[PDB]
Amino acid sequence: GSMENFQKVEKIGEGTYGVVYKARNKLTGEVVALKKIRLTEGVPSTAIREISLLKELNHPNIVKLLDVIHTENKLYLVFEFLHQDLKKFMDASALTGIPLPLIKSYLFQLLQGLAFCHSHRVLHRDLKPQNLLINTEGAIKLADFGLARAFGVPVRTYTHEVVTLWYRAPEILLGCKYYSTAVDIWSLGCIFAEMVTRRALFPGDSEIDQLFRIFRTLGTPDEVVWPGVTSMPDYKPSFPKWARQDFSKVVPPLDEDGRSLLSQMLHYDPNKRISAKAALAHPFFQDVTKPVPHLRL
Amino acid sequence: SVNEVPDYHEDIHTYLREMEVKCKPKVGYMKKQPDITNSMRAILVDWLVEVGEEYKLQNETLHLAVNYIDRFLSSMSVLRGKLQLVGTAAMLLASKFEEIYPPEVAEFVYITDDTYTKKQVLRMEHLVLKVLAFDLAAPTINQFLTQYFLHQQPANCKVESLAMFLGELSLIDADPYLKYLPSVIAAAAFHLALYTVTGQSWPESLVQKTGYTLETLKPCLLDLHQTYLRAPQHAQQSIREKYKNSKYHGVSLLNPPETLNV
Numbered sequence: 001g002s003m004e005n006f007q008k009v010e011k012i013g014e015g016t017y018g019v020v021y022k023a024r025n026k027l028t029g030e031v032v033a034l035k036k037i038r039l040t041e042g043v044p045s046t047a048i049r050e051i052s053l054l055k056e057l058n059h060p061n062i063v064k065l066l067d068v069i070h071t072e073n074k075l076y077l078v079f080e081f082l083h084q085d086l087k088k089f090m091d092a093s094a095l096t097g098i099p100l101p102l103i104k105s106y107l108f109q110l111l112q113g114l115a116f117c118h119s120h121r122v123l124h125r126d127l128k129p130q131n132l133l134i135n136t137e138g139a140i141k142l143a144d145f146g147l148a149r150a151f152g153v154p155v156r157t158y159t160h161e162v163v164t165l166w167y168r169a170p171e172i173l174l175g176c177k178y179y180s181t182a183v184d185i186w187s188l189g190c191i192f193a194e195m196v197t198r199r200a201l202f203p204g205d206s207e208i209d210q211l212f213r214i215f216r217t218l219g220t221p222d223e224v225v226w227p228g229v230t231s232m233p234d235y236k237p238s239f240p241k242w243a244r245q246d247f248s249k250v251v252p253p254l255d256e257d258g259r260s261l262l263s264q265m266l267h268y269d270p271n272k273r274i275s276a277k278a279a280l281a282h283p284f285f286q287d288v289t290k291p292v293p294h295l296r297l
Numbered sequence: 298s299v300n301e302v303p304d305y306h307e308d309i310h311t312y313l314r315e316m317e318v319k320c321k322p323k324v325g326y327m328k329k330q331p332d333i334t335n336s337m338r339a340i341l342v343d344w345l346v347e348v349g350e351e352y353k354l355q356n357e358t359l360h361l362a363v364n365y366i367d368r369f370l371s372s373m374s375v376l377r378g379k380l381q382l383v384g385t386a387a388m389l390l391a392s393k394f395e396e397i398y399p400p401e402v403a404e405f406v407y408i409t410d411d412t413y414t415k416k417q418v419l420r421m422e423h424l425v426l427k428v429l430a431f432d433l434a435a436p437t438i439n440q441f442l443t444q445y446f447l448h449q450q451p452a453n454c455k456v457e458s459l460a461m462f463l464g465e466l467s468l469i470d471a472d473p474y475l476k477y478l479p480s481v482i483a484a485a486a487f488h489l490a491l492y493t494v495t496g497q498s499w500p501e502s503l504v505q506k507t508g509y510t511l512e513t514l515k516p517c518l519l520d521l522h523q524t525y526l527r528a529p530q531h532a533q534q535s536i537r538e539k540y541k542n543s544k545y546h547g548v549s550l551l552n553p554p555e556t557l558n559v
């Protein structure tokens with residue numbers, strides 16, 4: 001691999017450090033995304049984790065890192081090209097909705113990708129629709145591993161400031177010393193609800209607002225539902241105590257199997273929350289297939 | 298608890314067992330290095346231990362750095378005057394990979410006593426990354442140790458700290474320890490700690506998990522036991538000092554067993 005073989009097509013995104021281009025390999029024809037990483041503290045730790053972790057993670061539902069081109073002044077990551085992110089797809093499906101067969105296909109694939117990460121001791125820690133990429137053949141893939149982390153068993157304390165707020169698990173919000181694979185499941189559950197409604201489940205504007213939004217939907221957790229909760233660093237006894245909603249009112253269009261799965265993905269207690277691996281076998285997926293997206297990308 | 302990832306720990310252990318074979322340094326590399334010796338390496342790692350202590354880095358970070366150093370030295374000849382530059386770059390990369398708050402590059406330049414420049418440290422970082430092909434997520438003795446700890450009944454803090462202490466000691470001496478895999482040194486260290494502290498042995502539950510028995514562990518166990526017995530005499534002492542600290546329950550003050558009865 002070398003930069004001279006690539007013809008740039010257009011810009012397709014940005015982050016840090018931080019521009020992403022769609023390009024094409026002049027010799028093979030292959031269309032790729034080039035994530036440019038501009039190089040006073042040397043190679044950024046986010047790039048180091050992203051590259052080293054993605055080189056181990058080869059799976060149909062994890063974005064494929066093809067190559068790393070590392071000049072002295074520049075670092076280019078070459079990924080397989082994927083046409084759209086799930087957020088843009090949901091916006092483009094407004095007023096119509098995403099067909100249930102596609103929602104089910106996407107969730108099933110996301111769970112496969114995530115189970116594979118967790119089996120390889122990787123926490124993603126930034127699952128949100130903007131970081132989930134779809135192609136024209138019906139695949140959806142985990143992307144943006146800059147915030148990911150290789151974990152140990154049992155986990156140690158890691159960075160506290162993780163996961164975009166709307167998708168952040170209650171154990172992170174309440175300052176637990178340890179968090180684990182369950183935080184990625186919480187995020188997928190929020191994403192599941194969002195695919196059905198096309199709006200964020202818990203759109204808070206601050207950590208406390210975010211907590212209270214969760215509490216008003218699922219009930220303020222107590223020692224019965226979540227042993228240890230009143231002992232956590234950022235739990236306050238002054239928290240309002242909201243009743244738990246009938247789950248059928250949380251995402252009304254969802255059938256019984258759907259509701260069952262969503263509820264197990266949004267369980268308060270991280271120890272009880274369903275795992276990706278176990279979720280693959282949920283009756284919700286009894287009829288799952290993999291259709292192409294219903295809209296042009 | 299989900300903190301011990303019950304649904305994945307078996308998959309994870311299996312995966313680390315595969316990766317440790319792929320991430321293993323070349324057992325015989327030192328003889329192929331014209332200008333450096335096991336003893337120079339020992340001095341380097343002992344220094345890294347001190348650096349880790351000064352900056353309150355995780356033990357895991359130290360284990361990763363040593364892995365990077367040994368893999369790098371498996372393919373690149375290095376002059377004695379550059380060995381510390383390799384080690385500093387490795388410790389910087391390990392910190393960026395593993396630490397919540399890695400030290401700044403400036404701080405790494407500082408602890409080398411202005412022997413190297415910031416530009417040298419950063420250029421070496423790049424070379425190490427290139428030589429390692431960015432493959433930094435390597436299994437360490439510590440990653441196996443923390444899983445083995447889950448098999449204690451009940452958990453014992455002295456056992457855990459002593460096992461980590463024994464594991465660290467092995468990082469210093471490429472001969473003989475380069476010949477054993479992390480999972481095996483960890484198993485030997487765990488058995489030796491358990492035996493020293495409680496009189497118990499490598500439990501059946503870990504035979505089930507690892508397929509290792511005291512017979513398969515014997516060679517490493519005999520070496521680790523010698524190392525433990527000679528530790529007060531060793532030219533390098535940073536690890537013993539480190540493990541006198543209450544943080545590690547002062548386990549380096551415990552007396553080794555005279556005999557193993559294996």
Ligand SMILES: OC[C@H]1O[C@@H](n2cnc3cc(Cl)c(Cl)cc32)[C@H](O)[C@@H]1O
Pocket residue numbers: 012013014015016018020033035063079080081082083084085130131133143144
């Ligand atoms: O930092 C990378 C940014 O680029 C966006 N992006 C858009 N299309 C993409 C296609 C691919 Cl294959 C990738 Cl890896 C990122 C993409 C990602 O969604 C992110 O916002």
